[PDB]
């Protein structure tokens, strides 16, 4: 049922994406229709200057779209050669592993207390704010 909820969520996020794009395609046309026959306004040239700037960074060959294709190149090469590097299996003693498990446990139980205190304090302070 947990796995079925993950599948419901992954359907409903994709359905919100459809509906939000449809709201945007309605509002865009209603605004073009609302301002039709009027000159460009200061709000509207500001909106355009921000959109032209954003479209600049999205097209720039050393911003996002260049880097994302180079990351995908690097990962493919590293995986193609990494599967031919030669495992040096450091066997670690069962009792050094027993101590490392206890260290990580006490540190994780400690982290859990800090993550309590920050949530506890962040609802107490909301009760002074009201």
């Amino acid at each position: 049922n947990q796995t079925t909820s993950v599948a419901k969520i992954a359907q409903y996020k994709r359905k919100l994406m459809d509906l939000s794009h449809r709201t945007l395609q309605v509002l865009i046309k209603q605004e073009i229709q609302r301002k039709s026959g009027y000159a460009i306004q200061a709000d509207e040239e500001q909106l355009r200057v921000q959109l032209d700037t954003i479209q600049g960074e999205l097209n720039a060959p050393t911003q996002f779209k260049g880097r994302l294709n180079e990351l995908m190149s690097q990962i493919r090469m590293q995986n193609h050669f990494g599967a031919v590097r030669s495992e040096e299996r450091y066997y670690i003693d069962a009792d050094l592993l027993r101590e490392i498990k206890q260290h990580l446990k006490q540190q994780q139980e400690g982290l859990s207390h800090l993550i309590s205190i920050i949530k506890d304090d962040l609802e107490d302070i909301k009760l002074v704010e009201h």
């Binding site: 709201t23 509002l27 909106l47 954003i54 994302l68 590097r85 450091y90 540190q107």
Partner: protein, 118 residues
């Protein structure tokens, strides 16, 4: 199941703000044209949408720069040693002790505010 909770109430907030976006389209169409110039809300929506694009582009720049940190060091990584592991445990523990010491120095101020106000 708790990982479904946080994904559901996020999607509920997302869906409730998109219902509120589409109410601006329903109100704009219902407003007579002789008053449609008094209804700022479509321009407030487009300004907020651009501010959301500007924040998303900072987040998507950071994750590319964190991925380029990760691959630039993973390209040199040739084994894990026991020394890399001990020095990772030691550094995370020293960061844990330092952050517990900071949190004490905030949690005591939270108590002093609490005993001043309730």
């Amino acid at each position: 199941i708790q990982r479904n909770t946080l994904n559901i109430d996020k999607l509920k907030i997302e869906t409730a703000q998109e219902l509120k976006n589409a109410e601006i389209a329903l109100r704009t169409q219902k407003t007579p044209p002789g008053l449609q110039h008094e209804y700022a809300a479509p321009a407030d929506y487009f300004r907020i949408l651009v501010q959301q694009f500007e924040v998303q582009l900072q987040q998507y720049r950071q994750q590319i720069e964190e991925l380029e940190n990760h691959l630039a060091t993973q390209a040199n990584n040739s084994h894990i040693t026991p020394q890399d592991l001990s020095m990772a445990m030691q550094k995370i523990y020293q960061t844990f002790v330092a952050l517990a010491a900071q949190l004490q120095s905030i949690h005591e101020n939270v108590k002093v505010l609490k005993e001043q106000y309730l």
